[PDB]
Amino acid sequence: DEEEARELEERAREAAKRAIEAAKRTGDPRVRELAEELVKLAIWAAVEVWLDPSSSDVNEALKLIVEAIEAAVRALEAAERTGDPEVRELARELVRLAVEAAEEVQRNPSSSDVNEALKLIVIAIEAAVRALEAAERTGDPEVRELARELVRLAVEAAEEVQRNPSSEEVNEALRKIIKLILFAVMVLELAEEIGDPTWREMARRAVREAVELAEEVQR
Amino acid sequence: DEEEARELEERAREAAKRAIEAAKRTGDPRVRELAEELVKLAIWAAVEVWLDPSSSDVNEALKLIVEAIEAAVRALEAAERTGDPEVRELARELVRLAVEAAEEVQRNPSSSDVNEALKLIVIAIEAAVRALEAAERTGDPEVRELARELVRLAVEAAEEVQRNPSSEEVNEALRKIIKLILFAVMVLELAEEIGDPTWREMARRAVREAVELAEEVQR
Amino acid sequence: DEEEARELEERAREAAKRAIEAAKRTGDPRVRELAEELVKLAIWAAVEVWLDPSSSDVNEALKLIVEAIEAAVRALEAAERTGDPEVRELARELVRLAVEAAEEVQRNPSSSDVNEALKLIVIAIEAAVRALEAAERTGDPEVRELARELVRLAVEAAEEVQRNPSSEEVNEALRKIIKLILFAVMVLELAEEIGDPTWREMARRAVREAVELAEEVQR
Amino acid sequence: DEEEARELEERAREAAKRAIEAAKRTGDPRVRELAEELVKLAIWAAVEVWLDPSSSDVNEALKLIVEAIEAAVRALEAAERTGDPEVRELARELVRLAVEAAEEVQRNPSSSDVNEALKLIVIAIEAAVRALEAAERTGDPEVRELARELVRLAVEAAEEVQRNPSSEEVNEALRKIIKLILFAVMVLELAEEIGDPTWREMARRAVREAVELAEEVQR
Amino acid sequence: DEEEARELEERAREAAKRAIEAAKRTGDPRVRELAEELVKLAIWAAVEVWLDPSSSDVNEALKLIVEAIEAAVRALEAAERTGDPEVRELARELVRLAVEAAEEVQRNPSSSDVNEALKLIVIAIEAAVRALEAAERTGDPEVRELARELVRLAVEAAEEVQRNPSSEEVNEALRKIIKLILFAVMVLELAEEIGDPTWREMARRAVREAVELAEEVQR
Amino acid sequence: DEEEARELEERAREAAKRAIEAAKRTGDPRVRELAEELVKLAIWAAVEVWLDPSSSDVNEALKLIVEAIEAAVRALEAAERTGDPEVRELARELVRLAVEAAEEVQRNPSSSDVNEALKLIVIAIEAAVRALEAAERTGDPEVRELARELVRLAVEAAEEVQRNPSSEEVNEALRKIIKLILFAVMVLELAEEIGDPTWREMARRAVREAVELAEEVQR
Lengths: 219, 219, 219, 219, 219, 219
Description:
The structure is a homohexamer.
Chain A: H1 2-26, H2 29-51, H3 56-82, H4 85-107, H5 112-138, H6 141-163, H7 168-194, H8 197-217
Helix pairs in contact in A: 1-2, 1-3, 2-3, 2-4, 3-4, 3-5, 4-5, 4-6, 5-6, 5-7, 6-7, 6-8, 7-8
């Protein structure tokens, strides 16, 4: 499968290049260390993919990893694009969660629960970046505070799923949280597409239910 | 199956957008609440489809659901397009039946009888909307009263199938009812295509048999 | 198999439309009742095909049925096209046999013998219509009386196969009859293609053998 | 397999048409009776193919039969094209052997030995017609007498294989005879392609061996 | 597999035609007898292929045989093209070995060892013809004497493999001989492509090792 | 699989031709002997591939071998292209390791460990040539000394894997070494693509860790 191999490889290279560009752009020591901790596992992906072609477990690990990296760099980029301190530190810790999970993957390529944990975290990151993009496109204060709210939700849920791979019940609660966050961001996108704030209020109801849930999920 | 995944997803998005457009158009609190109760399960479809790609039961549930939604929005739309109070409230309760069944689906993705119940209700809704379109195209009073008649039949049959998923005998009677309704609407379409009222009288005979049946099916 | 589904559906619709056109054209109460008894099972085919897609027994029943209908409408059409009373009543009872068999099918979708009986009757009808078309193209008196003769044979054979699905021996005799009729109509077509009456005399010998056989097949 | 069905059917029709054309052309009562005995089984092929589509044994019988017919009509045609009495009666009895074998096939569609017997006879007929065509193209007296010789061989071998389907030893001897005849006609074609009579003498040696063999094969 | 059948058949015909052309060209009684002994088995290939299509053992025998024939005619052709007596008689006995092996094949179509023996001999013949072509293209005396040398090797190895199909040890020694000959001719072709005699000396070393081996392989 | 066969064959021929060109270009007795020891196994690959087509183990051995050869000739070429004595002797012994492993392969086509050893050595060679190309493109002194460093690493690792095919622990340590070398060369390429020396310092850290590891791997 040299075609898929080279495809994944170029994806990894593109991820790393975009990460390094963003890091140079920000001129921030923290973002710098983050981008380095990211490009490292990107290049390690490339190496592992190379040495042993046509091996399915390894290939599966590699594709999911490079996907996570694309997500995280999108997140870092849009974060600095917004420029708001609160959301900036939020997304920074978010991408940190991403790279920590990916590191746990690179240490263990056949532990199912950590694979699924990275999956969930990738989804949460895509959710947060969708929300931030929507907020930027509308440029609406209430939309912005709601985006901060659900990004808080996303980072807290990802933190919790990162802490313990175990605990069925906590796992299901976190899965439901992620579902609610995705729901909120989708309905926000739709409300933006029609330009109606009433469904934005519906979304506010949805995320209010979500955060009330997450509160008890903390314990 | 990312191709089918994205296809279903865009279908769900298009359904929700058309629903919201119709709701804004009508400016009716009732239709508003209906469209909201609809777009909710549409977006929930999108989320569930996303989180777990390539899982067949979930995919099967999602496609059938978005089909039901397309049907219901067509129904709501053509209903307000006609403007007649009787048929308007009729189609409104019809789409309510649709969304209640779909909700029961979203609560349970592997109960066969409720899957088949939604199937039947979708069919009945397609039947009713076909009848209303035919009536609109001909613009004939007798055609209109017959359309009201078989729409009454459709809503009553759907109500009954919604009430109990069980009871083989009631199930078969309702299935036969739906078959007769489809038969009537097809033969009406044909009579419209040739412009002959004699086969409209044949259709009247058919639906008369159908409603006489449904009467005893009530008990 | 939505492609084959829609194909069969449009075939059924086209059959019904052509039937209704022919019935309007003839202005004959008998042909009218026949066309109605036909369009009914055509539309019932459409309904049954719809409700349960991708179910093989039902699909098999539907395709064979719509084929029978195409055959019968061709037969009714060419019959009134010829205008001769004898052959007209003949073909009328022929299409009646067709629709009676099709009705027996719609009542029972998994009885093999009646499936095969409809098959044979469809074949006989195609044979008769081929013979009538050939006679019309040549416009030859002897050809016309021979066509009447073998159409008599066809209607009698179809009547007998309709009477009893059972009785191996009568079944084989009727099958041989149908084979001989097809043979006669083919060799007549060929003789027409070359314009030689000598092979028409050979065909006369063939059908003479056929009718002598059918005589004892009556008992 | 409607495509292959219609293909075989048109092949049968074309065979019969060419046969009838040739028969009309010759104006010979004998050739007339032959062409009739041929077109009969051609049309019977068409019928049997029709009634029971997608049945492999029947299909296999039909294709082989129509192939035999194409061969025999080619043989009858080229025979009358040459005009020499000896070879004319020879090829006439040849095609008679062909149609007798084909009749035995139409009576029994699953007797292997008669299938193989028709196969061998078809091959022998193709051989004889190849030889006659080659002789016609060269227009050489010695070539013509050699063609008469190996056609005698072919008709005698076909007669013998027609007599008894059994007798392994006689079967193998006849198979070897057919092989030698094919060999002779091929090497004659080649010698014709280069225009060298020396290899014609080699072919004469080959057929001399062949006929010496056939002599003892008679007993 | 009528496509592959006709392909093999035309290949056989082309082989025979080229052989006969070469034989006519040389005007040599010996080459004449050789070409005849060749065209015979070519045409016999065609016959056997014909009578029993889609039979794998026979097909396998036929393709390998026609390949051997193509090789041998190439060899005879290039031999007379060179015009040197020594190599001429050499290649003549070479093609004689080829046709003797092919005859043994036509007598026995399922003896594995003789199949492999023909395989090896075909390879050796391709080797010799490659060497002769290379020598002709360079037109170098030392290249010519080396070509004579390795052609001697090839004919001796082929003679030995023809003598006994058995004897694992002699078989492996002959296989190694053929490998060394192929190696020498390839490295000679390469040296010719770059125009460097140093690798020609390397090739001389290779073939010297080869012939020293073959010496003891004689006993 | 004649297509893949001819593909591999032409690959082998192209490898040998490029090798001989490079050897002629350098005019160095050592490089000359190396290129000869290389072209020998290239041509032996071609022979073995030829004699036994469609045999998977042999085919697998052949493709991997010709890949190794392409790598080694690239290495020899770029080495003489750089012109630095240290790296020149380094790459020379490198390609010597390559050809020794390939020879061990040609002696044994089904020993797994030596297959994997050649695999690793091929990877290391591709790594070294990537590093040398990168250094040439940047033309940076520090880059050049780092390239010399990791090439030392590569040659030492390849030497060790060549020594013993056994010893799981030494095998895993060498595999990790190769991974680190690939990592370093990739991150160097990236740093070159962006023109930033900071990630070059990161690469220096990586290779420093690598060489500290290799030190203890020596014992």
